[PDB]
Design a protein around this nucleic acid. Structure first.
Lengths: 201, 252, 190, 139, 109, 175
RNA sequence: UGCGCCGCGACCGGCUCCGGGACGGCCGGGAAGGCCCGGUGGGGAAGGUGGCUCGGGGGGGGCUCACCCCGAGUGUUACA
RNA sequence: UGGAAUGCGAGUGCCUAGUGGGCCACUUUUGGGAAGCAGAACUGGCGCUGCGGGAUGAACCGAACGCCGGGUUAAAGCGCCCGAUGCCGACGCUCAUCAGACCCCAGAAAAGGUGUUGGUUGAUAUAGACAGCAGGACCUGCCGAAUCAACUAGCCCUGA
RNA sequence: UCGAUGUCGGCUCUUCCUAUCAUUGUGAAGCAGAAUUUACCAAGCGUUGGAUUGUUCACCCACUAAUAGGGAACGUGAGC
RNA sequence: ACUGAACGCCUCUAAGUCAGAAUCCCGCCCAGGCGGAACGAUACGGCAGCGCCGAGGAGCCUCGGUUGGCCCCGGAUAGCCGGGCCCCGUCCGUCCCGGCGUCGGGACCGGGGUCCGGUGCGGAGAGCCGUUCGUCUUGGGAAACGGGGUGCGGCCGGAAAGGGGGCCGCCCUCUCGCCCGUCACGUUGACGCACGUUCGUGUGGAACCUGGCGCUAAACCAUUCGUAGACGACCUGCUU
């Protein structure tokens, strides 16, 4: 499709999701990635923590304020992995990068929207079940991310409200089943047309 | 090659930018951690450095050579007239940090506090808060104030008071009050707001913030000394007498 | 080599009810209830029989490394069975040459205060795991008793106090001071 | 926890091979990846097929391993696997998915008219049951 | 009453890694993600519709700001549904990542 | 040599007739090669190191493909081979289950490359025979000698990735 | 001989990349495979069916009788 | 009967500039521990030469060049940067708290591992194997089917 | 690199390495205690004042927890 | 070190746990993004500017893109999804005595269970919603507890990053719309042809006229101060 592609980052693998997002954003699509703290990386946590600490050591020793900037929020960590997949020193790469929006948690614009999933980047698909993995949220917290408890309480409040919305949706759905039985005599012809054509069989 | 003899570096990089402070008033960068079980109290105050003198007291540390003996100790006197509460600020916790949610000001604000809102009080018409105050009197405005306190009650995690010093009582040329946010600690957000509301426009003496023989933190701006060489700024070793083109500098 | 099927069975006594919520095992017995998650092991758990129930663990197409988890799960479940029927009781003894080891129990067996270990004035306070009670024995002069249902909780508590009374900067071969686990058994014998 | 099993007699559905959409019977297991299969009543001759291309069904035939085609055929006809398969919900979904893919432009127009009228009647009844539910809950 | 063209995206020019041939453009057509699905679109007319500042004559209409570069789909590209197209004038580079219409006009079905 | 899916070739050759020997003996080998051109080259490789017969002094009397006699019957195959490692040469006996003799040999070349990094040029296959189930020796092959073989397919990886490439539903792998 | 400018179509020819349909030759004059309950046949085993024996687990009627489902042997077509 | 095959049109004179520092690679080879060291043979190359690939690079791999349109390849590639596997690719191996990841080429050895996977040789075990429960002091009884040893070579790990 | 890359040492100052002298946490001993030796994680912190010599190096005197070793164009001359 | 296989014993390791440091990361402290927020005041008085009512339109220039929407469970994956029934806790409103009694029921969730359906997901993103040639004469279905009016108000709607819909009353539009027929036409039947068909009353700018309600300020310089300072900058004072 098109419009804005909203991706739920939970359960995905970092680089495999980044490669797909980088190509979509180069193709002109606007992409939103939410819940970057739920992104997984292959390999045990300690090995992945060592990788980030080696990254932290890289720094211009004459003036580290000029040096490479080590963003600690998981959304900015994901933003930098996509950045390494883009020609970000050209105007085309910059414009594509501006089409990417990354978020920790699910802020107001996007919980009341349906999120998409990329099966080619899901951990349940691409990792063997016996292989160890890390959580970007925990890894970010151990290297200096300040807001993991706060994002956790806001996530919990969101999941409570999403749960009430889903029960109302379920009650509507079961009312619609009862409505179907009630008006079966007066909708039988229209149902017959649908069944013959592959809908409602 | 290596340094012949080791010596620790001169100065600290923990105060690295070593520039003029962007603020004249000292800033509280971390308030004491909130404990809801404790009663409602303030956490900071504003004073003025008057001078230094020395006192005589007898110490009570048993194993010391000065135990039960009279000692002379230098002290500093900080003049602290009472502060006037003029506002309340609410904050919400977000995954991007603490964000200012809503601030409410008192009905009558003194002229010395209004002076902080102007760079040229002489040329001003003194119109600051002249429309805001009318909201405290109008019936529609009163309802909005109550709704605004209720939203702060159910959404804010941090509550602060805007308070200013009274410069009428000080022997200073300056007449413009210093404004400050002072965090309210203890209790619940509802109890903090009720405490704040009732002493809005009121006076808080320093004895209700600090007590005797307690250990406090002092925040301020250091005495200015202008442009300085590396010998005074960083306390480097002076070069020998027979040095060409300068002694008070770092050689390499 | 991937073996097609590796299976093992645990017999459930008559005093114990085992319920399976997927790979979550709930064992209920006269002394209480124990819960344990096995979501980190990809095996299938089944309950067999109406009377004389059994727990069967299956692993399909497993390599050598993951065939070793079949008996590990079975042994753990046999531990929770004995935990809810007999309980776990670990007895410890204080060994000293000159300075007696004084042990005082606080908070109904939850806090252990050890004084005068090797004669020093630092008081060691060891906190037992939840569900583990520490007692001072009346049968022997200087012996502690840890009791509980979870074998891992009881033995971790014993390890906490054994490593608390550790000798530093001296030949550990000669001084030999400390509290050591003497025997592992059950609260009731059957 | 498992119900479907690769076993001799298990009927499987082919997903993506050259024989996609057929039913076969497992005659023998060559190894962990390949099984000897036979489709005597479904126009699939005996051959080796990977397990990756087959989706197991509920039907299990009764014949010994490596049995020849005539015994696989007798079992298939006795159990009437062709008619039992067509009666399942799995096959009904397949046939509905194929006929929707064959819908013409005129059939698309007629489905539009039927769906438009149908949803109006259902929506009216759903609202009536909403009002009944809210009135009964809060009289 | 509705759209009569298929949505395509100008992905880039036909190129190697370090040589770009600008007389051929590469297109990604929505819903076509395999080589075997690109057969329908072969020979189809494609249009790059854009807007400028000055008015230009419109066939069957009044002058407006819409300008078009015409082309046709020449052949498939890769085995992932991408196609290549030849436009009467080489496409501007500012159009990369933007919409190109495939008009269904020369019809074989 | 290289490999595709190998075929079996019966290659019969001999030396050219000479005044010393008017009727030289005929020699036969079974060669597993991608095509008949490689089969003839492989014949000359072995017969030259066995019988002192070079291609220039001989001829290929016959070269045809040996079809599998029971391609619908599951069999066990024993392979006797010798291969060159980085240090030394070794003799190995291996087992495979297959429907065809050629397929079993192709399995062996893949398995030697997988487990020993042995390339095809470093492998000599000297015997391939069909073994009864009772005379098999490797546990990997013996576990399929079970008349009631029965196993599930536990954790099926979704192989149709990128077909939607963006979906609302997360995949289920239980089946 | 050329359109003022912007375009469209048709058939013919050249090069080229593809898609359908149909015909035949050769091999071990292919290897297999299928049907005739093939025959009234002859042998051999096990990844051994039925039967028999031993142990186990779920059924019924009332803890005997018993209906299944397993495991282990023995055994060469019987109820595969 | 133009006395093997194949290919090709040959012969010849005068005048003649620049050059007469070379360098690199497969193989062979001398001195040197060795060297991006010094010195040789043969062929090709760089120098005189751009082009595709090796990220980058005189010499490597491919291929040599008038200005262009279509088609196809070489060497090399096809997650994203970046054209091309978005194949429902095939069989295995391997987890690294310094993993590995492609000629020249840009970093590792001897020696080791009860990590795991293959393979070779020998041996035990119905009279009864190896475990474990103990006794006498190598034998026994109880559990009752595979086990023990040496070696070898793949990936991974120590050596680092 | 010869139509010029200022040259020994010291002084001054920063940063880096670890093949660790001390200090934090440990393992081993021919570890009784004290003292010491061997090894592991480990370079955060510290590693001095002087007589002689232009010296690097060396040597001695004296404190010290220790008085470890090195690099940065054999760091650093429009800094001396 | 714990539990514990591999390897019937053993084992700190394989899965799963524990204690652990001058190291590491954060805090405390210093700075504060071509990074945000809340609040205040927003232009003389007779010449004017400015703000709100999506203000009401009519038009112009400019920058371009795009050419139906999906308003949402949490998640597991060696398992899941949907429906009524039991147990443990919660909630509203009807009588009884604002508050009580399960006084009874309906309507409810959260947890643990139990059954009944579904599971190559069909209560399905291989999906769903909407789906527009326009009017006219008139029939049959459906609806007539409906359509619309930012109509007018009223209630409940919400803070992670103000966007908010549903319900109630009174009017008019009233059964016209939605499905299948019938009847008669078309300012385009423009005589084969491209940029058509939307978002959209788009972003930004300036201006014209008309109607209401509103507003009448600061910043800098200059002058002072010395808590500051090379110069800038900074801290201050100037009818109370």
């Amino acid at each position: 499709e098109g419009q804005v592609l909203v991706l739920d980052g939970r359960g995905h693998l970092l680089g495999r999701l980044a490669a797909i997002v980088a190509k979509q954003v180069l193709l002109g699509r606007k992409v939103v990635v939410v819940r970057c703290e739920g992104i997984n990386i292959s390999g045990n946590f300690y090995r992945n923590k060592l990788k980030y600490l080696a990254f932290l050591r890289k720094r211009m020793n004459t003036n580290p304020s000029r040096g490479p900037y080590h963003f600690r929020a998981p959304s900015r960590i994901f933003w930098r992995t996509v950045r390494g997949m883009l020609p970000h020193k050209t105007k085309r790469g910059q414009a594509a990068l501006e089409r990417l929006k990354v978020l920790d948690g699910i802020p107001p614009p996007y919980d009341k929207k349906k999120r998409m999933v990329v099966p080619a980047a899901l951990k349940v698909v691409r990792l063997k079940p016996t292989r160890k993995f890390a959580y970007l949220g925990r890894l970010a917290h151990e290297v200096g991310w300040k807001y993991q408890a706060v994002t956790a309480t806001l996530e919990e409040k969101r999941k409570e409200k999403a749960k009430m919305h889903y029960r109302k949706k379920k009650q509507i759905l079961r009312l619609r089943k009862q409505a179907e039985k009630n008006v079966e005599k007066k909708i039988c012809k229209f149902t017959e047309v649908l069944k013959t054509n592959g809908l409602l069989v | 090659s290596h340094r012949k003899f080791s010596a620790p570096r001169h100065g600290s990089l923990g105060f690295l930018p070593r520039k003029r402070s962007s603020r004249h008033r000292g800033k509280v960068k971390s308030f004491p951690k909130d404990d809801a079980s404790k009663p409602v109290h303030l956490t900071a105050f504003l004073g003025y450095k008057a001078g230094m003198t020395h006192i005589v007291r007898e110490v009570d540390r048993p194993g010391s050579k000065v135990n039960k003996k009279e000692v002379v100790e230098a002290v500093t006197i900080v003049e602290t007239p009472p502060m006037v509460v003029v506002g309340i600020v609410g904050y919400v916790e977000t995954p991007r940090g603490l964000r200012t949610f809503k601030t409410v000001f008192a009905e009558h604000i003194s002229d010395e506090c209004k002076r902080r809102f102007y760079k040229n009080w002489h040329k001003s018409k003194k119109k600051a808060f002249t429309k805001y105050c009318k909201k405290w009197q109008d019936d529609t405005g009163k309802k909005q104030l109550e709704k605004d306190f209720n939203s702060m009650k159910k959404y804010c995690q941090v509550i602060r008071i805007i308070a200013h010093t009274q410069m009428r009582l000080l022997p200073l040329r300056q007449k413009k009050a210093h404004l400050m946010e002072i965090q309210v600690n203890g209790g619940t957000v509802a109890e903090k707001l009720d405490w704040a509301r009732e002493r809005l426009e009121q006076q808080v003496p320093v004895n209700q913030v600090f007590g005797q023989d307690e250990m406090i933190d002092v925040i301020g701006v250091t005495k200015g000394k202008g442009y300085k060489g590396v010998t005074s700024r960083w306390h480097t070793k002076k070069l020998p007498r027979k040095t060409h083109r300068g002694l008070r500098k770092v050689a390499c | 080599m991937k073996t097609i099927l590796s299976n093992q069975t645990v017999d459930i006594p008559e005093n114990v009810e085992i319920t399976l919520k997927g790979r979550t095992v709930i064992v209920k017995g006269p002394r209480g209830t124990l819960r344990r998650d096995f979501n980190h092991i990809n095996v299938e758990l089944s309950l067999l029989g109406k009377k004389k129930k059994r727990l069967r663990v299956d692993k399909w197409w497993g390599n050598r490394k993951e065939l070793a988890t079949v008996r590990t799960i079975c042994s753990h479940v046999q531990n929770m069975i004995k935990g809810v029927t007999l309980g776990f009781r670990y007895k410890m003894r204080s060994v000293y040459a000159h300075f007696p080891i004084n042990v005082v129990i606080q908070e109904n067996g939850s806090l252990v205060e050890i004084r005068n270990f090797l004669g020093e004035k630092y008081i060691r306070r060891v906190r037992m795991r939840t569900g583990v009670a520490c007692s001072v024995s009346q049968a022997q002069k200087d012996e502690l008793i840890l009791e509980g249902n979870d074998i891992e909780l009881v033995s971790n508590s014993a390890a906490l106090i054994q490593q608390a009374t550790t000798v530093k900067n001296k030949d550990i071969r000669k001084f030999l001071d400390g509290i050591y686990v003497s025997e592992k058994g059950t609260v009731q014998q059957a | 926890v498992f119900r479907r099993y690769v076993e001799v007699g298990r009927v499987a559905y082919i997903s993506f091979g050259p024989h996609a959409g057929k039913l076969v019977a497992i005659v023998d297991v060559i190894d962990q990846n390949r099984a000897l299969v036979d489709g005597p009543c479904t126009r699939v001759r005996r051959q080796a097929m990977p397990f990756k291309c087959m989706q197991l069904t509920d039907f299990i035939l009764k014949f010994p391993h490596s049995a020849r085609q005539k015994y696989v055929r007798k079992a298939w006809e006795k159990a009437d696997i062709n008619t039992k398969w067509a009666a399942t919900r799995w096959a009904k979904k397949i046939d509905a998915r194929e006929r929707k893919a064959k819908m013409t432009d005129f059939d698309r127009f007629k489905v539009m008219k039927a769906k438009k009228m149908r949803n109006r009647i259902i929506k009216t009844e759903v609202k009536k049951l909403q009002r009944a539910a809210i009135l009964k809950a809060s009289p | 009453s509705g759209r009569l063209w298929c949505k395509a995206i100008f992905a880039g020019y036909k190129r190697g890694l370090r040589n770009q041939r600008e007389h051929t453009a590469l297109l990604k057509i929505e819903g076509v993600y395999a080589r075997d699905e690109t057969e329908f679109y072969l020979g189809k007319r494609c249009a790059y519709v854009y807007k400028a500042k000055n008015n230009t004559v419109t066939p069957g209409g009044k002058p407006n700001k819409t300008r078009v570069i015409w082309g046709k789909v020449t052949r498939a590209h890769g085995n992932s549904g991408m196609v290549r197209a030849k436009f009467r004038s080489n496409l501007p580079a500012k159009a990369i990542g933007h919409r190109i219409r495939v008009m269904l006009y020369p019809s074989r079905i | 040599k290289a490999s595709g899916t190998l075929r079996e070739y019966k290659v019969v050759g001999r030396c050219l007739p000479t005044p010393k020997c008017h009727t030289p003996p005929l020699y036969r080998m079974r060669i597993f090669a991608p095509n008949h051109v490689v089969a003839k080259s492989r014949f000359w490789y072995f017969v030259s190191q066995l019988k002192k017969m070079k291609k220039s002094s001989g001829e290929i009397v016959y070269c045809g493909q040996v079809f599998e006699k029971s391609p619908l019957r599951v069999k066990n195959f024993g392979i006797w081979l010798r291969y060159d490692s980085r240090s030394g040469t070794h003799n190995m006996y291996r087992e495979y289950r297959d429907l065809t003799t050629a397929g079993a040999v192709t399995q062996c070349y893949r398995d030697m490359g997988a487990r020993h990094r042995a390339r095809a040029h470093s492998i000599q296959i000297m015997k391939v025979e069909e073994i009864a189930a009772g005379k098999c020796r490797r546990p990997a092959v013996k576990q399929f000698h079970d008349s009631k073989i029965k196993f599930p397919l536990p954790h099926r990886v979704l192989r149709r990735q990128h077909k939607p490439r963006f979906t609302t539903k997360r995949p289920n792998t239980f089946f």
